[PDB]
Amino acid sequence: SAQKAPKWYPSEDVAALKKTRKAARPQKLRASLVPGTVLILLAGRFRGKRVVYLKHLEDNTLLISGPFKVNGVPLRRVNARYVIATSTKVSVEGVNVEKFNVEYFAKEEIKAERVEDQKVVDKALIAEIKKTPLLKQYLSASFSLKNGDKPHMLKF
Amino acid sequence: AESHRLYVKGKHLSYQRSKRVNNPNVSLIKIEGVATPQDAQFYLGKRIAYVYRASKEVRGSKIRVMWGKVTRTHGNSGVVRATFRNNLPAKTFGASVRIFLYPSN
Amino acid sequence: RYGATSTNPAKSASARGSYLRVSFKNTRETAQAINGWELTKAQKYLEQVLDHQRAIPFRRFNSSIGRTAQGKEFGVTKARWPAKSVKFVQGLLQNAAANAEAKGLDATKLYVSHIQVNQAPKQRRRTYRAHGRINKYESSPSHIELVVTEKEEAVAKAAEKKVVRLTSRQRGRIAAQKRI
Amino acid sequence: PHPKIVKKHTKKFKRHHSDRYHRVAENWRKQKGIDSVVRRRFRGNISQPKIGYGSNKKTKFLSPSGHKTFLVANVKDLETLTMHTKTYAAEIAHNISAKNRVVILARAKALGIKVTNPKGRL
Amino acid sequence: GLRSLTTVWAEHLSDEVKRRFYKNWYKSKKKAFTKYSAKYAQDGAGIE
Amino acid sequence: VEPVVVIDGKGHLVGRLASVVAKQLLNGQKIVVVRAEELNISGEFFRNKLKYHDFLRKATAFNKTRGPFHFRAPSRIFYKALRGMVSHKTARGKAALERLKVFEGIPPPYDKKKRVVVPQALRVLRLKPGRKYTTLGKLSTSVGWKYEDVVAKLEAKRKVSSAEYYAKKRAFTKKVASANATAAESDVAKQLAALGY
RNA sequence: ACUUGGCGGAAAGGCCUUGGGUGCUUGCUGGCGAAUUGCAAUGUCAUUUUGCGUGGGGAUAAAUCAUUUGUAUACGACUUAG
RNA sequence: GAGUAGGCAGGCGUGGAGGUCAGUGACGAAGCCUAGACCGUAAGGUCGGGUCGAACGGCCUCUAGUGCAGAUCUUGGUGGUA
RNA sequence: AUUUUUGGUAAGCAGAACUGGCGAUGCGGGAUGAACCGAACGUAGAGUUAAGGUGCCGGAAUACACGCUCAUCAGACACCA
């Protein structure tokens, strides 16, 4: 005997968890995020881009696409904690976003369907945009903080 | 074109200290262009990072990042308190940090 | 046996001198003046410092000893001419060089790679002090042992790779800058 | 399964003036001086062992693995942790011969008991 | 205070004042003010 | 805000400026002070002379070398008053004072750089009209500093050349303001006056 | 990147200023491209100290010791000489 | 939930002793070395690597010439001054 | 040590009364200090405060408000110099 013997060994049978009292409720998105708003992206590949808000998803992310023919941003998920909602809104009463769900962005080069349905939504968006002056050039241009610019003072 | 900025320029002033004793867990950060606690309350809960350059490529790049978040305001004159994932090293008193516009409003 | 060496025993010869009655402090300093030299420049230097042309720079055991101009060579102010030490290490340089020839090493590239002076057991005499006291009067002999190796260039060349680990974001940005 | 292990004081409790003097070992010894700054607990001196540092009773005697270490001499001693594999980690004693380590590691993997030491003694 | 803006010499410095700049003189090649003396190659352009 | 700030030390209170500059340097903002010989101290010339003579007499008795060095220049009087307000013995303090330069007058590169002031350390903004003040140009020389009128020559030269520069810049800015005024009553100018710019 | 005349000595090492050339221009209409960095991860772009091989220009020494002197010298050092 | 003097309790460590683990061990006991590891609030315990060469350990109990930094302590050795 | 109090010119002197402290006590403050102020202490996190402060050293208003003071020996926080 290098070590004598512990007489009591614990019951290595694992216990069940207590019945958790918290069910998932639908997200309270801030009033400033209305489908059709132009969002300044804050992080990722497309940080400091201008993007167009299209749909709220099941995953509490935003289905957005700054039309690929303005800023090279495809139909994408974006987190709402990484956007600054501008006070400028494009009319989105001519786009079928009902196609897109969470399994659409299952990861599992680019798929032919994904490129064509990008072009379908892009046609409707760019038709709505070209009405308002300078808004394609705005959406084309990227965002950056300059000197004298104080985020807390800057309205959007 | 020239500008690429998507953070505010913070500076590591000091730690939370007494007249003598210091608390290296809470680091005091001065944000550029903030005056009062009212102006500072925009930046409450934001993500501050300290970007610095070592000489050894660790996992792709020689640049390393020490992450934190703004906890609350400090004093009367718009200073904030920041807590970092790992505390700051103190040799960075006067070094710049980046105050990102993460969790947004 | 023979304190830590980082050289090749196939290309080395050594020489040992145990319980040699020389000032340990003087013979440590002659050894540290001669260390990392060619054996030819070393042997010549030890005959020069016997006939008072160059001096052994005393670096560690350099307490209240007279300054000298022959120190300026070594960037010191204080140097000396330990005849006894220089003669003992000369005897051990020669004996090492003989072993290095007997094994078959080119005597031209032969450079002293290791030289170490340890302390021997102290030899015991008694002096006689005022008011009828006895004191110790101790010699501090030396354990000298040196190594001479053949010089070889073309090393390091060393060592390791850039066995890199990346994230989806890193690898994606590499794939982007390539597409650009 | 276990709660995330915390240790309130990780670094060792070195005896005062163990750094200063060689006669003094760093094996913790209570400062019983009448003027000792370590005993009187002045701002800036070393910290002393206090029961309050005591590790959580659910995380106590667990390794980083999450297994209570059990010293094992021979196969007879290993064959006691058979219904206790989620609970313990066999550790061969320092004085066991290489051939006896061959037998234990064979039996350890055959029953499915985690071991911290050998290594196979190459 | 005052500071030396520049000093200009004559091309012909005697072996007297040349000896000044050496401590083992008679081993030297005595090359002091060779290039400076050769700055008088044309109508002392560097000097004027 | 700027990478390096340049402060015109003229018409400034020594200690007040020194405190402002001492905090800037610890926060890690590179600053140069110039025209350090036109600094000001509250109270008449004689009071600050006596304050200095009280400082002069303070020396190490047993070897007057290693004792407190009494630096006489107005730049070095400011440096003393600023090094007082920083923990110069610490590595942070050494690094903090490394971000500072002080000059008697406006030398090169700074001769053609923009010069700021610190309103909370201006004599004109702070001292009650009626109170008497010192000029570090007169005090510094009365206590030892030799280069009073070397700096007066070099400043008088710089101010002649910089008056010529300004007279050319202003003569030009007349043409720029006139052409910008004749750009108004344009479609673009009315759209800008609507957006506020 | 190159030329013109200049001006700057306080730390001027920088300011102007010609003609030219060669690029870009969001002053304004166009036409393609960008996805997959997958919902963020600094997501790398600045400024130094550089030896390392290339291929071009350029120049081709001194000091120390040992010897010597005595304007100097406890020893160094100093001043000499070859 | 502080604590000198002080009391009491729970343990850690050492030389031996009775019992037990049909304990470990020349395929390497004990000892020593280890900017290697793990456990313990701690006293301490355990493991890896080296050197080494003949014994030693866990546990339940018995027993004591049982734990050192101080005694201008003892013996022996070693220094700085040098 | 505040208060009452004897001797003594007096004392960081000698001797009493009640209480609170140091001794045996760390911690925040009075720059420093056995005794003063604030608070008494297992190991941590968060929040809030005490006494004390918030020009700079130094965390924190070169805060606001009404006055006074100019000193060729200014003044600046109780015990306490």
UniProtKB/Swiss-Prot annotation, chain B:
GO biological process: cytoplasmic translation; ribosomal large subunit assembly; ribosomal large subunit biogenesis; rRNA processing
GO molecular function, one term: structural constituent of ribosome
Top-level taxon of the source organism: Eukaryota
Post-translational modification: N-terminally acetylated by acetyltransferase NatA.
Keywords: Acetylation, Cytoplasm, Isopeptide bond, Ribonucleoprotein, Ribosomal protein, Ubl conjugation
Entry-linked InterPro entries: Ribosomal_eL33, Ribosomal_eL33_CS, Ribosomal_eL33_sf, Transl_B-barrel_sf
Covalent cross-link (Glycyl lysine isopeptide (Lys-Gly) (interchain with G-Cter in ubiquitin)), residues: 46
Location of the protein in the cell: Cytoplasm
Residues bearing PTM N-acetylalanine: 1
Main location: cytoplasm
Stored PROSITE patterns: RIBOSOMAL_L35AE
The keyword Cytoplasm belongs to this UniProt entry's keyword annotation: yes
Ranges annotated as spanning the membrane: none
Cellular component annotations (GO), alphabetically ordered: cytosol; cytosolic large ribosomal subunit
More details: There are 2 genes for eL33 in yeast.
Subunit description: Component of the large ribosomal subunit (LSU). Mature yeast ribosomes consist of a small (40S) and a large (60S) subunit. The 40S small subunit contains 1 molecule of ribosomal RNA (18S rRNA) and 33 different proteins (encoded by 57 genes). The large 60S subunit contains 3 rRNA molecules (25S, 5.8S and 5S rRNA) and 46 different proteins (encoded by 81 genes).
Family (UniProt): Belongs to the eukaryotic ribosomal protein eL33 family.
Name of the molecule in the record: Large ribosomal subunit protein eL33A
Swiss-Prot record, chain C:
Signal peptide: none
Keywords for this protein: Cytoplasm, Isopeptide bond, Phosphoprotein, Ribonucleoprotein, Ribosomal protein, Ubl conjugation
A UniProt-annotated Pfam family: Ribosomal_L22
Residues where Phosphothreonine is found: 68
Bilayer-crossing regions: none
Location (main, coarse): cytoplasm
UniProt GO BP: cleavage in ITS2 between 5.8S rRNA and LSU-rRNA of tricistronic rRNA transcript (SSU-rRNA, 5.8S rRNA, LSU-rRNA); cytoplasmic translation
SUPFAM superfamilies per UniProt: Ribosomal protein L22 (SSF54843)
Location(s) in or outside the cell: Cytoplasm
Misc remark: There are 2 genes for uL22 in yeast.
NCBIfam families in UniProt: uL22_arch_euk
Family from the record: Belongs to the universal ribosomal protein uL22 family.
Subunit organization: Component of the large ribosomal subunit (LSU). Mature yeast ribosomes consist of a small (40S) and a large (60S) subunit. The 40S small subunit contains 1 molecule of ribosomal RNA (18S rRNA) and 33 different proteins (encoded by 57 genes). The large 60S subunit contains 3 rRNA molecules (25S, 5.8S and 5S rRNA) and 46 different proteins (encoded by 81 genes). uL22 is associated with the polypeptide exit tunnel.
Name of the protein in question: Large ribosomal subunit protein uL22A
Gene this chain is encoded by: RPL17A
Curated annotation (Swiss-Prot), chain D:
Keywords: Cytoplasm, Phosphoprotein, Ribonucleoprotein, Ribosomal protein
Swiss-Prot/TrEMBL GO biological process terms: cytoplasmic translation
Phosphoserine: modified positions: 36
Family: Belongs to the eukaryotic ribosomal protein eL32 family.
CDD domains per the UniProt record, alphabetical: Ribosomal_L32_L32e
Its biological purpose: Component of the ribosome, a large ribonucleoprotein complex responsible for the synthesis of proteins in the cell. The small ribosomal subunit (SSU) binds messenger RNAs (mRNAs) and translates the encoded message by selecting cognate aminoacyl-transfer RNA (tRNA) molecules. The large subunit (LSU) contains the ribosomal catalytic site termed the peptidyl transferase center (PTC), which catalyzes the formation of peptide bonds, thereby polymerizing the amino acids delivered by tRNAs into a polypeptide chain.
Quaternary assembly: Component of the large ribosomal subunit (LSU). Mature yeast ribosomes consist of a small (40S) and a large (60S) subunit. The 40S small subunit contains 1 molecule of ribosomal RNA (18S rRNA) and 33 different proteins (encoded by 57 genes). The large 60S subunit contains 3 rRNA molecules (25S, 5.8S and 5S rRNA) and 46 different proteins (encoded by 81 genes).
Domain of life the protein comes from: Eukaryota
UniProt-recorded name of the protein: Large ribosomal subunit protein eL32
Keyword Cytoplasm: yes
GO molecular function: structural constituent of ribosome
Designated gene of the protein: RPL32
Cross-referenced InterPro entries: Ribosomal_eL32, Ribosomal_eL32_CS, Ribosomal_eL32_sf
Source species of the chain: Saccharomyces cerevisiae (strain ATCC 204508 / S288c)
Transmembrane recorded as keyword: no
Main location: cytoplasm
Location of this chain's protein in the cell: Cytoplasm
UniProtKB/Swiss-Prot annotation, chain F:
Record keyword Ubl conjugation present: yes
Post-translational modification: N-terminally acetylated by acetyltransferase NatA.
Any single Gene Ontology cellular-component annotation: cytosol
Gene Ontology biological-process entries: cytoplasmic translation; maturation of LSU-rRNA; negative regulation of translation
Family matches, as NCBIfam families: L13_A_E
Cross-link (Glycyl lysine isopeptide (Lys-Gly) (interchain with G-Cter in ubiquitin)): 175
Subunit (UniProt): Component of the large ribosomal subunit (LSU). Mature yeast ribosomes consist of a small (40S) and a large (60S) subunit. The 40S small subunit contains 1 molecule of ribosomal RNA (18S rRNA) and 33 different proteins (encoded by 57 genes). The large 60S subunit contains 3 rRNA molecules (25S, 5.8S and 5S rRNA) and 46 different proteins (encoded by 81 genes).
Pfam families: Ribosomal_L13 (PF00572)
Domain of life per record: Eukaryota
Family: Belongs to the universal ribosomal protein uL13 family.
More about this protein: Present with 43300 molecules/cell in log phase SD medium. There are 2 genes for uL13 in yeast.
TM segment ranges: none
Protein function: Component of the ribosome, a large ribonucleoprotein complex responsible for the synthesis of proteins in the cell. The small ribosomal subunit (SSU) binds messenger RNAs (mRNAs) and translates the encoded message by selecting cognate aminoacyl-transfer RNA (tRNA) molecules. The large subunit (LSU) contains the ribosomal catalytic site termed the peptidyl transferase center (PTC), which catalyzes the formation of peptide bonds, thereby polymerizing the amino acids delivered by tRNAs into a polypeptide chain.
Stated name of the protein: Large ribosomal subunit protein uL13A
